[PDB]
Each structure stands twice: as structure tokens, then as C-alpha cells.
């Protein structure tokens with residue numbers, strides 16, 4: 001059985017850590033909601 | 040129970056100890072998460088209960104106690120902010136310029152940040168602090184990193 005806990009507020013944080021890339025990917029989306037890489 | 044706006048953890052005691060299966064957004068008294076997190080099951084908040092209202096396995100989204108309320112969209116230009124709620128760890132804002140999923144049915148934003156599956160349902164935010172979608176449906180790339188679709192719903 002499942003329960004929820006308030007883990008924080010939702011705001012934009014000025015000077016958050018900035019990281020990751022921005023890849024452009026060809027994907028499919030199946031009936032089960034699974035994304036997969038099209039190549 | 041608790042009905043306050045904000046980001047929440049989704050926990051279960053069905054496994055060893057207290058395990059975090061995912062994360063969601065309380066807004067306008069409605070709780071928003073991803074279908075895979077709850078599989079549409081009821082939720083406890085104190086001695087308050089939350090029943091499912093809307094859900095779609097292909098959108099991988101579910102709302103509780105009312106219809107889907109988040110409508111804001113990625114502009115396609117700006118760095119967003121994810122609000123990562125990782126298991127056992129404090130909420131942390133990570134800034135990233137999204138990538139794109141190109142699909143045979145139009146383009147959607149994508150976020151290339153590594154977090155464990157329990158972070159599933161952690162929200163993504165625009166510069167006014169609006170939830171433009173939810174993080175934790177997506178795909179593994181060559182690297183072995185994670186790239187989530189930015190998943191968002193429709194408001195009636």
C-alpha cells in the first residue's frame with residue numbers, strides 16, 4: 001500500500017546546478033507507453 | 040490529511056523497509072504522478088485517502104481526486120528546471136536545456152539527467168515555476184545514461 005510525503009515546494013531556484021546535454025533522438029512510442037530508440 | 044500545493048514522494052511498505060517508488064505534484068487539490076509509479080492504485084495521506092480520477096497507460100500519467108490540472112508547455116528555447124526528489128535525498132533543482140524526441144507524431148522535449156527509477160514523477164519547471172511536465176518515462180542512449188521524455192497531460 002502507498003502513501004505520500006511533502007518532499008518540498010515547487011519554485012525555480014536562481015543559480016541551480018546546471019548540467020546534462022540536449023540530444024535530438026528519433027524514438028517510437030508503443031501502445032504500452034514504452035519509448036524506444038529509432039535508428 | 041495534506042492537500043497543500045508542492046512536490047511529494049510516493050512510498051510503499053510492501054518491500055523491505057520504506058521504499059520510494061516515485062514522485063508527484065499536488066496542485067488545485069489534485070495529485071499528478073506517472074501511471075508506472077502507482078499502476079492506478081489508491082494513495083494514503085495521513086488518514087486521508089486519494090482515489091484515482093483519470094489515467095492513461097500510453098501517456099504514462101494518472102491524476103487523483105480531480106482531473107489533470109497542469110497545462111504549461113516547454114517553449115522549445117529556454118533552459119528549464121527539473122526538481123529531482125531522489126530516494127532518501129533532499130529535493131534538488133537541476134538546470135538543463137532539454138533535447139528532443141522526434142516521433143512519427145510530432146516533437147516533445149527530452150531531459151538527459153541520470154537519476155534512479157524511484158525519481159520517476161519528479162517534475163520539470165519553466166522560469167515562472169510552472170510544471171511543464173513530469174520526468175521518468177524515456178529511453179537509455181548509447182552512453183547508458185537516461186533521457187526522459189518531458190511527459191505532460193491535457194486540461195479540460
Ligand SMILES: CN(C)Cc1cc(/C=N/c2cc(Cl)cc(C(=O)NC(C)(C)CO)c2)ccc1O
Pocket residue numbers: 032033034035075099152153154155156157158159160174175176177183184185187
Ligand atoms: C511504459 N513504461 C516504459 C513505463 C515505465 C517506466 C519506468 C521508469 N524508468 C526509469 C525512470 C527513471 Cl526517472 C530513471 C530510470 C533509470 O534507469 N535511470 C538510470 C540513471 C539509468 C538508473 O539506473 C528508469 C519503469 C517501468 C515502466 O514500466
